[PDB]
Copies of this chain bind each other. A is one copy, B any other.
Amino acid sequence: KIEEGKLVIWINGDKGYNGLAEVGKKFEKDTGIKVTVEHPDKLEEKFPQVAATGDGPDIIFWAHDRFGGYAQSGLLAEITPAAAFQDKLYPFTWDAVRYNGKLIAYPIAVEALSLIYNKDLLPNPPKTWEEIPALDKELKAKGKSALMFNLQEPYFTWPLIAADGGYAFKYAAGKYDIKDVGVDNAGAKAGLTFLVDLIKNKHMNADTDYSIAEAAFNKGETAMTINGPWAWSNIDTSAVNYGVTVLPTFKGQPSKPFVGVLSAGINAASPNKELAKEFLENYLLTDEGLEAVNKDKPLGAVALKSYEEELAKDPRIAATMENAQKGEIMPNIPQMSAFWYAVRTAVINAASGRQTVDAALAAAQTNAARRKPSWRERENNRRRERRRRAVAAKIYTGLRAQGDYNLPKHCDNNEVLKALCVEAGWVVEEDGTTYR
């Protein structure tokens, strides 16, 4: 729970949380406010469960796509930076964090997936997904593999699903059609089918996750991985000479990654809303602030103009933004959570062979549009069945007390029902078959 005078921050465990803790420390020495940074597991899921009751951190860091739902639920404090501060950031990073006309978080950095490759094993990375199988057969003879990346999170597979035409929610007339899903069209199918065939032909393992892929690449066992800018520092500490480049094409079309905007939202339940703005605006979103974080784990293309003109000169950032130009900014609508869950189930289920690609994506389609039942809807159902049982119970209480039926000492209401049937001229067999 939040309490006046201190600041607690939640950020994902793959971001530079020590670097950010360094920013809170300098914030503590200047103002005397202690700042604790924490990287709990599944924080994008825990926050909406505890913020409702008033708990959660002061600030929550995540990509912009989850913030619309948070705001829809009233969990986020409206952000109102002065004009002078708004002009410090690229306008399009502000667009990413505006929901229903209001700013619901501070944008931090732009993230896109790129192809990361081992220049020593692979001086010339492939330009196409199609040549990866042959490349893997060649490397497998030397004890290596072509490509490993996280298959448990649809974020990493979506660039390939969207290459040939797959899309989450169609954008038309200036809006997102919560009810036009493109996870089951020919383009999406072709992409997921190629990925599953990679597994069938034993070029990838269905159970490969984030840490397995990162280990294999950082140890030099795989020639390529797909990851974001946060991964670079761990490769830097390794003996691998890597390059960051454009993702491969599929059927001649570019891979289209979903582009994330790492953002910091303020808990509407927080008693330190002003202290959090002072920290975010005048400590984190500064050259020295982002630098301290970026030096920990690279941020990507930061939203702060003054510091991005520097980072934009890193060829790895230029490749990140090359991939981001071919991708799309993720929607922030509340249904993005349902989209991500459904597509996650589809990828995992087709990769494992539990479902065909057709069946997996067919179900993902309906799931990604499925509306979550409201609290009142659940309560209507719960009360109806309560009522249904209470009415029956009172009828059988009456039959038992006044029926004077020949019932055993202990018997269920089916037996009472039977004695009521017999009384009313009915015959009831052992299995319930009933007639006059």
> How many copies make up the complex?
2
User: Could you tell me if B391 and A414 are in contact, using CB atoms closer than 8 angstroms?
Assistant: yes
| A428 on the B face (CB < 8 A) | yes
Is A435 part of the binding interface, using a Cβ–Cβ cutoff of 8 Å? yes
Q: Are B432 and A417 in contact (CB under 8 A)?
A: no
Cβ of A313 within 8 Å of any chain B Cβ, yes or no, is no
Q: Is A38 an interface residue (CB 8 A)?
A: yes
Closest 9 CB pairs of A and B: A398-B434, A394-B432, A391-B432, A424-B424, A395-B432, A395-B434, A423-B424, A391-B414, A402-B436
Do the beta carbons of B209 and A393 come within 8 Å of each other?
A: no
- 27 A–B pairs (Cβ distance < 8 Å), ordered by A: A21-B219, A38-B211, A388-B414, A390-B432, A391-B414, A392-B414, A392-B432, A394-B431, A394-B432, A394-B433, A395-B417, A395-B418, A395-B428, A397-B434, A398-B428, A398-B432, A398-B433, A399-B426, A399-B434, A402-B434, A402-B435, A402-B436, A420-B420, A420-B421, A423-B424, A423-B425, A424-B424
Query: What does the 1/0 interface line of A373-397 toward B look like (CB < 8 Å)?
Result: 0000000000000001011111101
Nearest-neighbour CB distance to chain B for A283, whole angstroms, equals 19
**Chain A interfacial residues counted at CB < 8 A:** 39
Residues of A within 8 A of B (CB): 21, 36, 38-41, 209, 211-212, 215, 219, 388, 390-395, 397-399, 402, 412, 414, 417-418, 420-421, 423-426, 428, 431-436
A402 to B391, CA, bound (A): 24
Interchain CB contact (< 8 A) of A394 among B41, B388, B412, B434: B434
